Amino acid sequence: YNDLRDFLTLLEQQGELKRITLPVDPHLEITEIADRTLRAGGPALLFENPKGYSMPVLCNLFGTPKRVAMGMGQEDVSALREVGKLLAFLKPTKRLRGAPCQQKIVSGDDVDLNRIPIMTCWPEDAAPLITWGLTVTRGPHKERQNLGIYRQQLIGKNKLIMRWLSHRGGALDYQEWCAAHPGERFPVSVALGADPATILGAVTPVPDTLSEYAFAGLLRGTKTEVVKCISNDLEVPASAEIVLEGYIEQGETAPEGPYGDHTGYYNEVDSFPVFTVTHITQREDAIYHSTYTGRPPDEPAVLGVALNEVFVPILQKQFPEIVDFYLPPEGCSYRLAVVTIKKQYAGHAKRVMMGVWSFLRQFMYTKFVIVCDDDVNARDWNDVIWAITTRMDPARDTVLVENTPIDYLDFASPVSGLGSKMGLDATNKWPGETQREWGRPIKKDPDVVAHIDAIWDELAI
Amino acid sequence: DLRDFLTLLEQQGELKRITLPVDPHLEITEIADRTLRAGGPALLFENPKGYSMPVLCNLFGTPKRVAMGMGQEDVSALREVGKLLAPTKRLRGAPCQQKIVSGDDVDLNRIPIMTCWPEDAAPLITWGLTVTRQNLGIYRQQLIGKNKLIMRWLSHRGGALDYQEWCAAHPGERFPVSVALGADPATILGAVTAGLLRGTKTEVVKCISNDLEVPASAEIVLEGYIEQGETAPEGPYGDHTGYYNEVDSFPVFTVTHITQREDAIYHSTYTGRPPDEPAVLGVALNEVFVPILQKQFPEIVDFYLPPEGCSYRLAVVTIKKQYAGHAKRVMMGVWSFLRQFMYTKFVIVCDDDVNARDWNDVIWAITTRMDPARDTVLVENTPIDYLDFASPVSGLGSKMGLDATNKWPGETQREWGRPIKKDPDVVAHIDAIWDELAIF
Amino acid sequence: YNDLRDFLTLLEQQGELKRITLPVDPHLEITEIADRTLRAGGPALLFENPKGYSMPVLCNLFGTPKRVAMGMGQEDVSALREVGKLLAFLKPTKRLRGAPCQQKIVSGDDVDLNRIPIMTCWPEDAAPLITWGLTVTRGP
């Protein structure tokens, strides 16, 4: 639906947006509330009263599954499947100017970032943290562009940190910019508070054949209204609320953190490049879209559970035996995985593990995989825990693999960025696998299950 | 009394009368099941399909209701002291005896006894307090004829032993047996190796047809005898493991008399894939162990055996970690100190900033504080439950210890992570204006 | 290129087909030779003289890499890559009758398979073995 405010109004109508008029602190307070809400499951929150401020602070926007699907075109969290039928089958822009995004420009020394209500998220964080900027960058060589969400710690008056992670095509953009034009400044533009369509295209992997304004905008019904930036010849989305324009001074970096991670812990200080902003271009009643992360759940963590319903089809195409796949938010949205399969032969559950650990680059860091038959609900601990404890001999049934790629930040692994993984084969063991008669699992009649649904309300309990 | 207890529960909002005609056959289990899985109220199906005797089930599908059943409401402030430490009363008149029925008049078929799972044998009596000093035992009873139930004790037990001390003493002579259906809460909470609970001595009354003394709070009563060497094939049935049994032969208890209150209520339950009614009751009664295990290992904050692992098969343990290697002593403790836990396959150890009862917490800790290969203890050829078909050989298998505790120097070499804590202050500042922000 | 015999002739031209006129046994012998050839790397072999027979026995057709690529359209075993660019990117028929394939029909009891020179491949195999039939089946 159109631009961010157009989407905004839809929610407020159906009781999916909430209006807080009370004075709320960007320092830790707005965070605390959004967690209470998300942990129990309230609506999105808009804050027309930041304490000592006057710019609205929007958080918890995609804070439950339903906020995502409506943000994609539908009502049913079932057509998130169809978003994923899309990316595996693939195996367009529209420019403006006096476009709403740049109506108010503040350049040069007038640039004071203390003017915006950036969230200070948790107890011993460093400075306040810009958590929801959609970073735009260009490769010097080609022309095709790159989006990304990095956490942007404000250190100075108009200085910001680019916490990008080496691998990202976004980081690779800067690296090749110093390489071809050495000692020369690298233009970046980070756009804030955007429309639903490109925003869910920003937390998503696309094959490098199609731009992520073309996929993202065609999750909406309308091709992407974009624009030239004032200080550079790279594109920011037009539906924007605040747009940041600057460059990174070559060699110049600052100490970053501590910050709490969605891991539930404090990242220890480590240094990163300084994006210096020469322009802050905005609307009027302009908004600033924001979030946070911590000991899971959190917004990304739900956004994560959201995202993965999208992956399922991709996985299913490649792995038809996979009935269902799911990474819990308890396990940092990515560290543990339950897969459920139609088992087709002894040994089967291992083909699946190694598949999971390798096929998608997202799932390359997943320490724990638990594979069970299609009569186990992946999404329920009752089932999975039953699964594990009735259907496995632990030593017989556990794949342990060593010296594999693991997070540079995961302090549990024996060395930095190299640790071990564990598969759990909790599938019923066919012969070859066991020499004992296996148990006949109680299975429920789908009929009886069906009749009792028609009756469930008109039974009120 | 039970019917008091029921009204208490009904007021509190902890019980639901259901007026729809619903089949004792398979339907009730399905309803009782979805319910239990949601913290559901106890169920009173006032009209079962093809019976007029109302059915009560899922009485205990709630840790709260186990507690309300003793007069209290914590369960861990309560049962827990109940093992730091670790007479009846007869009457001349009972409600439970009001309607008597002898001979060919006896038809068990008019009782709404349940069938719980699709492939189950025949209908099954699940909450019968069998009576045999006297011995009380909750034995599963398969319906096989107008006046015939299979009595499935397994040979070692007390009530089963009563029958051998019968064959020994009076060969040929039929053994007397009576079964009460539904007593007062405290009588029902016959469990763990009887139970005081309320504190007033249990009131019994004499059986009409034989020399046994059944709970006066009875709703129904089944009295009769076992002819020596009469057997029926029992099963196959669903049990707590998630699976069906094999057909197996047992004694045949013949009912001569049925005694019941007017406005009789059938107390029935179902055992099935965890969690079920029993497995929940079990988790309540297990609170009894924690202090015992503490006397021995003062490091243990919490020892908790989830029912989703069949109520014994997996233990999560939180400890106040004292030195490097600690999580290990605690594992080998679990596996050898008390005999109940000698068959526990999986034992997860976490530091005490983790809520043993919360998969969110536990999974958080496993996935943040473990290097799988480094922190997993596999031991094999260890004694395992022989009925467990998952071990390579009946009676022998491998165990698993997950060390999810934090790693101290020498256990690692990385700077370890420090947990984010929430600001006790921003706790207070919100402790006020939450209500006054109606987010809904 | 067209039909099998059209492809056949291309090879014989460039020294990639070989003509054996000598009497050769379907039982193990034709096998032995094709192995000698393939292990060192001779051409494809056509046998206008099976021993006790008169139907030509063609073997070792794709017996080296180059016989494959020419069989696909090219000369360079490098565009076999391009055959594979095809199957991952994808992520039409034309019927005849008196078509060459059915000019001679033998049905019923006249069907004697001992009429064909099926290869008997190695020492203690069972019976002779039809090794190169392209089986067609339909789902009901």
Side-chain angles (χ1 to χ4, degrees):
Chain A
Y1 296 74
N2 213 324
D3 62 6
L4 187 67
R5 296 201 211 199
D6 279 321
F7 176 59
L8 273 195
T9 352
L10 203 149
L11 319 141
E12 177 171 355
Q13 284 178 332
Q14 305 167 143
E16 296 251 310
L17 197 27
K18 227 282 135 193
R19 305 194 142 277
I20 293 86
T21 51
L22 273 80
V24 224
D25 202 344
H27 164 106
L28 332 185
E29 299 208 315
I30 303 173
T31 329
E32 175 62 17
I33 297 165
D35 226 350
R36 303 220 172 179
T37 331
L38 215 149
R39 297 229 164 217
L45 332 192
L46 185 43
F47 291 102
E48 284 126 41
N49 199 351
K51 186 205 293 250
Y53 291 111
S54 62
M55 181 185 279
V57 166
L58 160 55
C59 64
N60 212 113
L61 172 68
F62 290 120
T64 72
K66 192 142 75 66
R67 262 166 263 161
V68 186
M70 303 198 304
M72 288 178 150
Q74 9 285 128
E75 323 153 64
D76 247 51
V77 206
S78 72
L80 267 129
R81 225 81 199 287
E82 296 228 316
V83 189
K85 287 186 215 286
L86 272 198
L87 276 135
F89 182 65
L90 340 164
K91 159 69 209 173
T93 321
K94 187 165 171 158
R95 198 199 280 180
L96 324 179
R97 188 198 144 206
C101 76
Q102 283 146 8
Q103 305 163 302
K104 244 223 68 214
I105 302 156
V106 168
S107 65
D109 275 338
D110 298 314
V111 175
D112 199 333
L113 291 152
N114 284 296
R115 216 161 182 171
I116 327 178
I118 305 155
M119 303 199 48
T120 300
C121 301
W122 286 76
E124 314 128 42
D125 285 344
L129 186 68
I130 308 179
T131 68
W132 249 119
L134 324 170
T135 288
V136 179
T137 41
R138 204 214 221 179
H141 308 315
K142 282 131 225 161
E143 293 143 0
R144 181 234 148 102
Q145 282 193 167
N146 150 98
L147 321 169
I149 352 275
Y150 317 122
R151 73 176 177 207
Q152 268 138 343
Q153 180 204 309
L154 137 153
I155 28 150
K157 196 162 187 53
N158 85 302
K159 302 283 201 168
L160 296 173
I161 297 166
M162 199 79 84
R163 217 267 176 150
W164 52 29
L165 322 156
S166 187
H167 47 266
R168 288 287 315 182
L172 309 185
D173 268 355
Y174 178 47
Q175 208 152 345
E176 297 162 354
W177 182 273
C178 312
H181 321 249
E184 216 233 342
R185 314 170 151 185
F186 172 68
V188 199
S189 298
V190 189
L192 293 148
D195 64 303
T198 309
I199 278 190
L200 300 184
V203 287
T204 265
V206 170
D208 299 332
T209 64
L210 58 145
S211 85
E212 307 207 25
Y213 277 117
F215 174 80
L218 284 155
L219 264 167
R220 226 180 323 117
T222 149
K223 292 185 174 194
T224 307
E225 273 189 339
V226 302
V227 62
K228 199 153 97 84
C229 291
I230 308 86
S231 37
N232 62 79
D233 292 306
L234 317 186
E235 294 196 338
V236 300
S239 42
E241 317 282 65
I242 325 180
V243 165
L244 314 155
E245 285 159 45
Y247 78 97
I248 314 159
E249 194 61 284
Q250 315 229 289
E252 198 200 356
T253 75
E256 199 254 29
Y259 278 113
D261 210 334
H262 84 298
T263 78
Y265 292 75
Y266 283 128
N267 283 242
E268 292 287 328
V269 64
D270 164 29
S271 310
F272 288 100
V274 183
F275 171 50
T276 318
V277 159
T278 57
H279 288 68
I280 3 147
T281 80
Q282 67 194 83
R283 296 167 85 181
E284 225 57 72
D285 273 48
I287 324 179
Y288 156 79
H289 188 191
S290 210
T291 206
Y292 78 112
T293 34
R295 146 77 209 277
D298 58 55
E299 223 225 319
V302 152
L303 260 143
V305 188
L307 210 198
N308 303 349
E309 275 315 323
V310 200
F311 280 162
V312 173
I314 290 167
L315 258 167
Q316 284 208 342
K317 253 152 190 182
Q318 184 51 54
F319 291 124
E321 56 267 73
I322 290 174
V323 180
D324 177 31
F325 171 76
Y326 163 92
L327 296 101
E330 314 83 306
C332 310
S333 304
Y334 79 77
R335 299 202 169 174
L336 176 155
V338 161
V339 189
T340 56
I341 65 171
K342 269 133 203 187
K343 219 220 191 167
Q344 272 162 54
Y345 44 96
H348 208 174
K350 278 94 172 148
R351 201 213 141 192
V352 200
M353 303 170 206
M354 306 190 289
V356 169
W357 281 323
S358 73
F359 178 69
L360 272 168
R361 254 204 218 78
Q362 274 89 171
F363 306 146
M364 67 157 128
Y365 289 123
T366 304
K367 307 210 262 201
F368 291 95
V369 199
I370 294 188
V371 198
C372 322
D373 304 80
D374 65 347
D375 70 325
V376 140
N377 174 349
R379 300 190 174 55
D380 185 341
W381 285 113
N382 291 298
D383 270 349
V384 177
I385 291 286
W386 168 74
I388 296 197
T389 58
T390 51
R391 292 182 172 168
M392 76 187 279
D393 176 287
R396 180 179 84 205
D397 296 349
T398 292
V399 191
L400 275 157
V401 165
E402 302 184 28
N403 288 110
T404 64
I406 272 291
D407 259 294
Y408 292 86
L409 268 164
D410 196 323
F411 52 91
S413 84
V415 306
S416 181
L418 183 73
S420 69
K421 290 188 171 58
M422 177 182 281
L424 277 89
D425 177 354
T427 72
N428 296 286
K429 297 312 182 300
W430 309 18
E433 272 167 339
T434 180
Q435 291 224 279
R436 309 261 301 266
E437 255 169 295
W438 208 245
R440 313 173 26 224
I442 286 160
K443 338 127 221 138
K444 297 176 126 186
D445 199 331
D447 281 354
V448 195
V449 190
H451 169 54
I452 303 277
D453 289 323
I455 264 189
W456 195 245
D457 306 338
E458 310 148 57
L459 258 192
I461 323 191
Chain B
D1 306 50
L2 173 55
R3 295 214 223 166
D4 300 320
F5 176 66
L6 287 167
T7 344
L8 169 62
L9 270 171
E10 178 162 4
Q11 283 171 340
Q12 301 301 125
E14 293 286 330
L15 182 136
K16 219 230 113 85
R17 319 181 88 78
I18 150 277
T19 46
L20 248 158
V22 157
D23 200 344
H25 183 269
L26 277 176
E27 287 191 344
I28 286 175
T29 316
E30 170 61 18
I31 319 179
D33 191 45
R34 300 186 186 200
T35 304
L36 191 150
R37 299 205 181 239
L43 300 197
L44 180 67
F45 290 94
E46 252 164 350
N47 201 311
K49 200 164 238 152
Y51 301 87
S52 64
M53 189 175 331
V55 161
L56 170 90
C57 60
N58 184 66
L59 197 90
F60 288 126
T62 294
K64 164 157 204 215
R65 299 199 252 106
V66 204
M68 287 186 144
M70 344 172 162
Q72 297 113 319
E73 218 177 54
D74 264 57
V75 117
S76 78
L78 316 160
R79 270 296 264 204
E80 268 219 10
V81 203
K83 212 205 185 86
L84 257 157
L85 173 132
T88 85
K89 210 166 167 285
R90 176 151 136 173
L91 289 172
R92 286 291 155 281
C96 75
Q97 308 213 318
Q98 277 170 283
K99 284 198 158 146
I100 317 156
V101 151
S102 52
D104 314 322
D105 262 305
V106 156
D107 187 21
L108 282 160
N109 280 115
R110 51 143 277 278
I111 299 174
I113 326 180
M114 286 160 38
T115 297
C116 337
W117 301 119
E119 278 139 46
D120 279 341
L124 183 78
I125 291 178
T126 64
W127 259 123
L129 308 139
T130 298
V131 200
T132 45
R133 188 206 296 98
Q134 273 185 190
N135 269 3
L136 225 157
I138 314 170
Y139 299 116
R140 168 164 97 188
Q141 293 134 333
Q142 157 161 18
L143 184 79
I144 33 89
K146 189 179 204 153
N147 59 327
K148 300 259 165 188
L149 296 158
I150 318 184
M151 184 68 69
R152 193 178 181 265
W153 37 49
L154 272 122
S155 208
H156 73 272
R157 309 149 166 172
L161 279 174
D162 276 351
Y163 183 75
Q164 264 146 47
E165 308 184 310
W166 191 262
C167 303
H170 329 291
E173 277 177 22
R174 310 158 166 188
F175 181 72
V177 167
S178 301
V179 177
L181 286 165
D184 79 290
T187 286
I188 292 150
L189 300 144
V192 164
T193 181
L196 48 91
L197 310 220
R198 75 184 163 271
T200 303
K201 327 144 153 298
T202 78
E203 294 188 25
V204 305
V205 64
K206 174 184 130 68
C207 286
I208 278 92
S209 47
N210 53 60
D211 296 4
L212 308 151
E213 308 152 337
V214 293
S217 257
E219 275 280 340
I220 303 132
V221 159
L222 326 187
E223 289 162 14
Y225 69 90
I226 310 177
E227 258 172 313
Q228 251 146 232
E230 205 207 307
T231 80
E234 210 260 9
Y237 280 121
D239 66 23
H240 86 272
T241 78
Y243 300 89
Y244 291 95
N245 284 150
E246 276 171 24
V247 46
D248 207 315
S249 252
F250 284 96
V252 185
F253 152 60
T254 309
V255 178
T256 65
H257 294 80
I258 309 159
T259 283
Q260 46 173 122
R261 304 176 67 166
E262 286 157 62
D263 276 272
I265 272 148
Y266 181 61
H267 183 69
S268 203
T269 193
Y270 73 91
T271 185
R273 176 194 297 205
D276 52 31
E277 178 175 339
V280 165
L281 243 162
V283 104
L285 326 149
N286 290 343
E287 278 291 335
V288 134
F289 291 124
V290 192
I292 302 275
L293 258 180
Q294 286 172 297
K295 302 180 208 163
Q296 192 60 39
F297 308 97
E299 48 254 89
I300 304 154
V301 176
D302 196 2
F303 174 83
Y304 166 63
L305 281 176
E308 330 85 290
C310 314
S311 298
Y312 79 97
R313 264 184 224 197
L314 179 163
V316 173
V317 192
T318 65
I319 68 153
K320 284 158 183 308
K321 192 170 176 135
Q322 289 184 354
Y323 37 44
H326 202 173
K328 263 107 218 170
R329 189 181 162 273
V330 162
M331 285 166 196
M332 307 176 304
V334 178
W335 290 323
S336 67
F337 181 62
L338 293 163
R339 208 158 308 104
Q340 291 85 324
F341 309 144
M342 77 159 321
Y343 292 143
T344 305
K345 284 186 219 171
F346 296 84
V347 159
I348 321 195
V349 186
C350 298
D351 330 74
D352 74 347
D353 83 319
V354 177
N355 174 3
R357 287 101 199 309
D358 196 335
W359 285 123
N360 273 30
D361 257 28
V362 194
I363 304 289
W364 172 71
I366 278 154
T367 54
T368 63
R369 307 176 181 177
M370 289 200 78
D371 165 67
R374 203 193 53 209
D375 305 306
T376 294
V377 190
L378 282 147
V379 193
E380 15 213 351
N381 303 127
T382 89
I384 290 291
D385 193 320
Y386 69 122
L387 285 196
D388 188 318
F389 65 71
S391 69
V393 310
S394 160
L396 189 96
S398 58
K399 275 158 175 51
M400 187 193 263
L402 300 99
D403 193 343
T405 76
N406 275 304
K407 304 279 133 48
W408 296 14
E411 318 205 298
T412 163
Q413 220 94 347
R414 317 285 300 292
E415 255 183 19
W416 200 264
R418 297 133 50 255
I420 313 166
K421 273 145 202 173
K422 265 162 169 169
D423 207 304
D425 258 311
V426 199
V427 142
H429 211 278
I430 315 272
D431 271 322
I433 65 147
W434 168 257
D435 323 63
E436 208 223 22
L437 256 188
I439 237 139
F440 293 110
Chain C
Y1 296 74
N2 213 324
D3 62 6
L4 187 67
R5 296 201 211 199
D6 279 321
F7 176 59
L8 273 195
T9 352
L10 203 149
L11 319 141
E12 177 171 355
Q13 284 178 332
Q14 305 167 143
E16 296 251 310
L17 197 27
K18 227 282 135 193
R19 305 194 142 277
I20 293 86
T21 51
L22 273 80
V24 224
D25 202 344
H27 164 106
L28 332 185
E29 299 208 315
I30 303 173
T31 329
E32 175 62 17
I33 297 165
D35 226 350
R36 303 220 172 179
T37 331
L38 215 149
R39 297 229 164 217
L45 332 192
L46 185 43
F47 291 102
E48 284 126 41
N49 199 351
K51 186 205 293 250
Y53 291 111
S54 62
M55 181 185 279
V57 166
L58 160 55
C59 64
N60 212 113
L61 172 68
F62 290 120
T64 72
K66 192 142 75 66
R67 262 166 263 161
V68 186
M70 303 198 304
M72 288 178 150
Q74 9 285 128
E75 323 153 64
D76 247 51
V77 206
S78 72
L80 267 129
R81 225 81 199 287
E82 296 228 316
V83 189
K85 287 186 215 286
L86 272 198
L87 276 135
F89 182 65
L90 340 164
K91 159 69 209 173
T93 321
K94 187 165 171 158
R95 198 199 280 180
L96 324 179
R97 188 198 144 206
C101 76
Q102 283 146 8
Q103 305 163 302
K104 244 223 68 214
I105 302 156
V106 168
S107 65
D109 275 338
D110 298 314
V111 175
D112 199 333
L113 291 152
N114 284 296
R115 216 161 182 171
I116 327 178
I118 305 155
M119 303 199 48
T120 300
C121 301
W122 286 76
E124 314 128 42
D125 285 344
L129 186 68
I130 308 179
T131 68
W132 249 119
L134 324 170
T135 288
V136 179
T137 41
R138 204 214 221 179

